[PDB]
Design a protein around this ligand. Sequence first.
Ligand SMILES: CC(C)(COP(=O)(O)OP(=O)(O)OC[C@H]1O[C@@H](n2cnc3c(N)ncnc32)[C@H](O)[C@@H]1OP(=O)(O)O)[C@@H](O)C(=O)NCCC(=O)NCCS
Length: 227
Amino acid sequence: GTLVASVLPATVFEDLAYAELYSDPPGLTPLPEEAPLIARSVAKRRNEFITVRHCARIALDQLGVPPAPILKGDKGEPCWPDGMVGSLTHCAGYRGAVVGRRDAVRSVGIDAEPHDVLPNGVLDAISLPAERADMPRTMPAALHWDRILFCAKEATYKAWFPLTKRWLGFEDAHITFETDSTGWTGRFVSRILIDGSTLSGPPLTTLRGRWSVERGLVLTAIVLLEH
Ligand SMILES: CC(C)(COP(=O)(O)OP(=O)(O)OC[C@H]1O[C@@H](n2cnc3c(N)ncnc32)[C@H](O)[C@@H]1OP(=O)(O)O)[C@@H](O)C(=O)NCCC(=O)NCCS
């Protein structure tokens, strides 16, 4: 239950919490207030939705937030409790939540991916030329740098959207990577190439994150601090 800790910072760790699961536990019914969000959904969506919301409430509870419904807002963003921020993700074999206190943490974005190739047609749609040239030179050959780049792009959108309420395209952020000498973890910086105007606080120009590959999964997390 600690895979996502591999991408969280020590700077604000006291004001963060996380919860993850690797399958959908039986006997979970949706909260009534949340059931409308999946009323028309296929079973696989209904089950992961319920599991991921379960993780969110577990993590929120660790920070002293009483369990409650988490509704869906502008463009599908989760509606966190007052004073809280967070991000949610699922893929085959992963469901996870990371949350933080807004006094310490301005935004969170996470993503989980299978550590598998992407098709070369999806690569150009999700990358800049500079990323396709640079990431090979910064990442050991054993890693699926196409998939890790994509994971970081998704973490970037999720950290961005709640602060801007604007689209961020695959071509609107240039992501540069570093690999730790261990070769399965590292850091990235997402450089925003468009207007970074936010609803409050300073504009978004650069979002720093972490990445990890373990147990056939990529994880990324961005944790923007309140300054
Ligand atoms: C929205 C998106 C990022 C979700 O990622 P995903 O890999 O499809 O799915 P994940 O399981 O990792 O994430 C899903 C969760 O993201 C969260 N999410 C959805 N829309 C969101 C938004 N606008 N802002 C923040 N979080 C959002 C939700 O909690 C959702 O799960 P829920 O519906 O169960 O609440 C993705 O589907 C998408 O639309 N991407 C396009 C935007 C983009 O990536 N731009 C590139 C920026 S450099």
